[PDB]
Amino acid sequence: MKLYIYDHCPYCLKARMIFGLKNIPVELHVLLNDDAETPTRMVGQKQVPILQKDDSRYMPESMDIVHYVDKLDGKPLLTGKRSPAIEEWLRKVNGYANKLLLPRFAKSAFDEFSTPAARKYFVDKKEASAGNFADLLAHSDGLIKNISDDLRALDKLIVKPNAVNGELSEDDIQLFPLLRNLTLVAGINWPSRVADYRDNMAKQTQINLLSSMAI
Ligand SMILES: N[C@@H](CCC(=O)N[C@@H](CS(=O)O)C(=O)NCC(=O)O)C(=O)O
Numbered sequence: 001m002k003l004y005i006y007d008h009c010p011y012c013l014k015a016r017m018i019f020g021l022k023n024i025p026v027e028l029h030v031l032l033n034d035d036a037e038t039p040t041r042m043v044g045q046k047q048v049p050i051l052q053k054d055d056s057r058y059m060p061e062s063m064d065i066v067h068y069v070d071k072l073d074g075k076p077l078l079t080g081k082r083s084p085a086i087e088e089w090l091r092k093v094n095g096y097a098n099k100l101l102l103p104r105f106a107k108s109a110f111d112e113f114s115t116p117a118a119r120k121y122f123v124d125k126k127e128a129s130a131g132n133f134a135d136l137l138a139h140s141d142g143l144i145k146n147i148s149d150d151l152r153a154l155d156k157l158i159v160k161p162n163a164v165n166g167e168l169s170e171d172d173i174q175l176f177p178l179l180r181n182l183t184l185v186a187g188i189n190w191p192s193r194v195a196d197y198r199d200n201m202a203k204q205t206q207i208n209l210l211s212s213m214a215i
């Protein structure tokens with residue numbers, strides 16, 4: 001199977017997670033952020049992730065790909081209970097996390113931004129939507145405090161470092177991509193239980209953390 005992604009893309013990360021959790025090999029391909037032609041040939045419009053199944057057919061939609069791959073061997077892993085507290089925490093943190101992440105993604109060495117035009121495409125589309133990146137970056141100190149404090153709240157909710165609610169669930173697929181991308185943010189104070197969850201899920205999923213290029 002092949003997965004066509006952006007490295008920063010949280011939807012893409014959800015799809016990458018399930019391959020890692022199931023120990024199913026997959027060939028990753030990072031598309032340039034401005035490449036409409038390639039995803040359009042596969043699924044009809046520019047979007048990632050895109051799965052190429054072992055029958056060569058292409059499938060879009062992270063939700064569909066996650067559940068397709070989880071069921072492949074008739075042994076689904078995503079069986080644990082959902083947590084309203086975790087889901088509510090994610091809604092709260094998603095209220096502002098992109099104010100930190102988008103301007104940092106635009107300055108980072110992800111392969112989807114490896115041409116100038118791709119990087120400019122991202123900046124032009126996301127500034128229009130999120131607002132002036134300079135202004136967002138000038139507000140970093142408050143935003144970094146807010147996420148450090150929110151992670152202190154999450155610390156008390158993590159049941160096991162291998163599964164947020166104790167058994168692997170839909171909530172791990174929603175939580176880990178956010179925690180992975182937040183390792184790009186220099187200055188966050190990571191509590192112990194959250195750092196262990198983040199590291200264990202990075203190891204299980206075989207998805208890299210971003211500490212080495214944090215800004
Ligand atoms: N409903 C789809 C959403 C994928 C999506 O919007 N992905 C974004 C990248 S993410 O970093 O925001 C995307 O494909 N953007 C490309 C564009 O809109 O030009 C799914 O669940 O897989």
Ligand SMILES: [Cl-]
Binds near residue numbers: 062063064066067170
């Ligand atoms: Cl899902």
Ligand SMILES: [Zn+2]
Binds near residue numbers: 006
């Ligand atoms: Zn994106």
Ligand SMILES: [Zn+2]
Binds near residue numbers: 063066067170
């Ligand atoms: Zn799901």
